[PDB]
Amino acid sequence: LDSAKKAEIVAKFAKKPGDTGSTEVQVALLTARIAELTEHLKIYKKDFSSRLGLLKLVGQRKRLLSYLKRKDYNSYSKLITELNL
């Protein structure tokens, strides 16, 4: 939110001249703010999980656990118990 968008939201959600502060305006403003903060967290996770290989690792373990089920199910079930998986 720059100053201009903030000001567009107000002009939109207003119900009379001077409405910088109806329930509707505030809600619209909080929504814009909450949205921008939320896409921050979304894109951080996206580019931390990617940059540091979390999805790589998880998919790696997926395949190994799958092959472990299949090659030795007993050990497999013992293992996911000991790791709280």
Side-chain angles (χ1 to χ4, degrees):
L1 52 60
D2 74 308
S3 193
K5 278 185 176 186
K6 271 180 51 46
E8 287 167 46
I9 293 141
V10 183
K12 180 161 215 167
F13 297 92
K15 0 240 76 206
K16 185 204 158 191
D19 176 347
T20 313
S22 65
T23 308
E24 295 87 341
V25 168
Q26 291 189 62
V27 174
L29 262 18
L30 281 159
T31 299
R33 275 207 272 157
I34 287 162
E36 275 41 279
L37 265 63
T38 287
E39 219 195 320
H40 168 76
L41 283 174
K42 160 173 204 146
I43 296 306
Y44 173 65
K45 186 188 175 188
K46 248 210 157 200
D47 307 353
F48 163 97
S49 297
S50 156
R51 208 181 281 95
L52 288 79
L54 186 132
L55 297 197
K56 205 214 198 218
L57 296 189
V58 176
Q60 208 166 310
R61 175 180 60 184
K62 102 200 142 197
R63 289 190 306 276
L64 283 162
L65 278 175
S66 281
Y67 155 76
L68 190 57
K69 284 194 218 165
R70 197 114 204 175
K71 173 219 179 170
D72 186 322
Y73 186 87
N74 171 41
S75 163
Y76 162 80
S77 61
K78 282 175 92 159
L79 181 73
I80 55 158
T81 291
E82 186 60 71
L83 300 181
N84 316 319
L85 283 179

